[PDB]
């Protein structure tokens, strides 16, 4: 039985909305409570520490502690795609020196795609590779991209791109293969894509 409990998620939240992360702990005599953010392949960074019942604000972040109900919460106001990370809840138990860490909640903040323009485009190697590569792009954040069941076809998950200068975000996924039956027409077949998805040429 776990001493700090968090739902793994992923928790999907639309950009601008409040993201709500919750954490429960079994040690009622716990004195210290922490939220850490961890980007994939990076290290835990402190978002909030909290010690007293109530709310503690730091910018867009609010920690909420309730020792009677044995929960600690994190609200992210005005959520951005850049908030997409694993959030770790940590608790110092009674007498303990070290923190006990939850297994974390993965948060995904989905951009609002003002004007969806879903398309699959073909890229050729700048130099030379056996690889034909297909780019699905400019789809609405409600579209999900599945991996292929096709041996030797590689599909990446949707990925949020932010051209800050132009205040423009877009989703994309990459499929590639050196197989002769792989076309940009059939690459994303194992995904539900819009009808009205643009296949050029």
């Amino acid at each position: 039985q776990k001493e700090v409990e968090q739902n793994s998620g992923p928790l999907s939240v639309p950009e601008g909305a409040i993201a709500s992360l919750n954490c429960t702990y079994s040690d009622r005599g716990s004195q210290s409570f922490f939220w850490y953010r961890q980007y994939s392949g990076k290290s835990p960074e402190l978002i909030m520490s909290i010690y007293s019942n109530g709310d503690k604000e730091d910018g867009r972040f609010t920690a909420q502690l309730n020792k009677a109900s044995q929960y600690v919460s994190l609200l992210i106001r005005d959520s951005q795609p850049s908030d997409s990370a694993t959030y770790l809840c940590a608790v110092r138990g009674t007498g303990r020196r070290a923190l006990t860490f939850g297994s974390g909640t993965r948060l995904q903040v989905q951009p609002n795609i003002q004007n969806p323009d879903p398309a699959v485009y073909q890229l050729r190697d700048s130099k030379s590779s056996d690889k034909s590569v297909c780019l699905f792009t400019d789809f609405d954040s409600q579209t999900n991209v599945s991996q292929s069941k096709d041996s030797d076809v590689y599909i990446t998950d949707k990925c949020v791109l932010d051209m800050r200068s132009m205040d423009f975000k877009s989703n994309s996924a990459v499929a590639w293969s050196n197989k002769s039956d792989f076309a940009c027409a059939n690459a994303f077949n194992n995904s539900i894509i819009p009808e009205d998805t643009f296949f050029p040429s």
Partner: protein
């Protein structure tokens, strides 16, 4: 803050290594944690002050020494594949822990499974440029093992983050094989005007962490050492 060496290591089973944690924040308390998919950071050992240490949750197979207050050593004397993990050091004044950047260790039966990435850049679709007035470059890093890469874009000499998206985690090239080689993709999206200017140099840089030059290599193919692999493209009209 908190620093650690090394950042990355490949070991053969049976081999030894040391991880050094350092902090200059005058913290009395230091901690060594391992992080594995789908569980909380697990504490290995900790120290309450110089010349003392104490067992955490998962002390087995690891030793520690606290030389001065600034330093905390973690030793693996006989590396086992179970010790494949990310190790984070941390320190506190009292209860609030600040984390080092982590050490990614991969322990392998055989180092002939190690491969550096092949890296290729694919130029934007004309169809995309004409339809969007935008241009997406794709970089693929393929055939690498273990999962020890850092992909960055460099445009006309400067590392860029704007218009970039790198998969947060690599694909297995054969999800079946336990020791599958990996692929990682990144996109850089620019205005079609910026792409159409041949004065513009796009470089995808993939830092791979492999073997030390010290490691024995007998095989025909180039020893898969720590190295940077780049692929580049120039704008065209």
């Amino acid at each position: 803050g908190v620093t650690q060496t090394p950042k990355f290591r490949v070991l053969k089973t049976g081999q030894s290594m040391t991880l050094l944690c350092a902090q200059d924040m005058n913290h009395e308390y230091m901690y060594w944690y391992r992080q594995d998919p789908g569980m909380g950071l697990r504490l290995i050992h900790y120290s309450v002050g110089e010349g003392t240490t104490a067992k955490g949750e998962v002390p087995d197979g690891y030793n520690v020494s606290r030389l001065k207050k600034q330093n905390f050593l973690l030793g693996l004397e006989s590396a086992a594949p179970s010790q494949t993990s990310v190790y984070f050091c941390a320190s506190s004044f009292t209860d609030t822990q600040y984390f080092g950047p982590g050490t990614r260790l991969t322990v392998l039966e055989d180092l002939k499974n190690v491969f550096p990435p092949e890296v290729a850049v694919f130029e934007p679709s004309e169809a995309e440029i004409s339809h969007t007035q935008k241009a997406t470059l794709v970089c693929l890093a393929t055939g690498f093992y273990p999962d020890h890469v850092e992909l960055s874009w460099w445009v006309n000499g400067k590392e860029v983050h704007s218009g970039v998206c790198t998969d947060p985690q690599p694909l297995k090239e054969q999800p079946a094989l336990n020791d599958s080689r990996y692929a990682l993709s990144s996109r850089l999206r620019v205005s079609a005007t910026f792409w159409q200017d041949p004065r513009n140099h796009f470089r995808c840089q993939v830092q791979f962490y492999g073997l030390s030059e010290n490691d024995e290599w007998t095989q025909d193919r180039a020893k898969p050492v720590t190295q940077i692999v780049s692929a580049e493209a120039w704008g065209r009209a």
